[PDB]
């Protein structure tokens, strides 16, 4: 499967 | 709270699209939740075998294979389904 992404301040 | 992705700012409950570094498309959501959290999912799309290029549902492209020219089309249908046909007049 293709990768997704996640993020947030302080990453 | 807000989300910051690629110099763009989104509101909580906002949805948007984003191109992964690898080239495939993502559908995303801004949660914020105190830290500006966001998530992105791989959209249903097609990936060309030879070129490794990504095409979106409804997209059409051409390619030369063994000197033969084809018109290709991304159907998706939940499995990134795509088919090609030889050029004809
Ligand atoms: C992407 O779209 C699907 C529906 O096609 C949805 O269920 C999913 O929550 C979305 N992903 C994100 C992180 O927004």
Author numbering:
A (entry chain F): 260 to 270
B (entry chain B): 516 to 604
Sentences from the paper on this structure:
Fibronectin (FN)3 and collagen, two essential components of the extracellular matrix, are key players in diverse cellular processes, including adhesion, migration, growth, and differentiation. FN is a high molecular weight multidomain protein composed of three conserved module types (I, II, and III), individual structures of which have been elucidated previously. In vitro, however, 6FnI1–2FnII7–9FnI binds strongly to gelatin, the denatured form of collagen, but not to triple-helical collagen fibrils; 6FnI1–2FnII7–9FnI was thus named the “gelatin-binding domain” (GBD). Collagen binding to the GBD is mediated mostly by the 8–9FnI subfragment, which interacts with sites on D-period 1 (1/10 site) and D-period 4 (3/4 site) of both collagen type I chains.
At a distance of ∼1/10 (D-period 1, peptides AN and CN) or 3/4 (D-period 4, peptides BN and DN) from the N terminus of the triple helix, both chains contain a consensus 9-mer 8–9FnI-binding sequence, in which positions 2 and 9 are occupied by leucine and arginine, respectively. To examine the binding of a collagen 1/10 site, we determined the crystal structure of 8–9FnI in complex with peptide AN. Thus, the molecular basis of this association is the strand extension mechanism commonly used by complexes involving FnI modules, including the high affinity 8–9FnI-BN complex. In-depth comparison of 8–9FnI-AN with 8–9FnI-BN revealed a striking similarity in atomic interactions. We were therefore surprised by NMR titrations, which revealed significantly weaker 8–9FnI binding affinities for the 1/10 sites (KD = 143 μm for AN and 2 mm for CN) compared with their 3/4 counterparts. Just N-terminal of the consensus 9-mer sequence, both high affinity collagen 3/4 sites contain two hydrophobic residues, whereas the weaker 1/10 sites harbor a GTA (AN) or GTO (CN) triplet. This residue triplet makes no contacts with 8–9FnI in the AN or BN complex structure and has poor local electron density. Interestingly, the collagen peptide in both 8–9FnI-AN/BN crystal structures displays a 90° kink just C-terminal to the consensus 8–9FnI-binding sequence, stabilized by hydrophobic interactions involving the Phe92 (AN) or Phe794 (BN) side chain and the peptide main chain. Indeed, when we overlay the 8–9FnI-AN/BN crystal structures onto the SASREF GBD model, the collagen peptides follow the GBD kink, so their C termini would be ideally located to bind to 6FnI1–2FnII7FnI. Thus, we conclude that although the 8–9FnI binding mode is conserved for all four collagen type I sites, residues outside the central consensus 9-mer sequence influence the association strength.
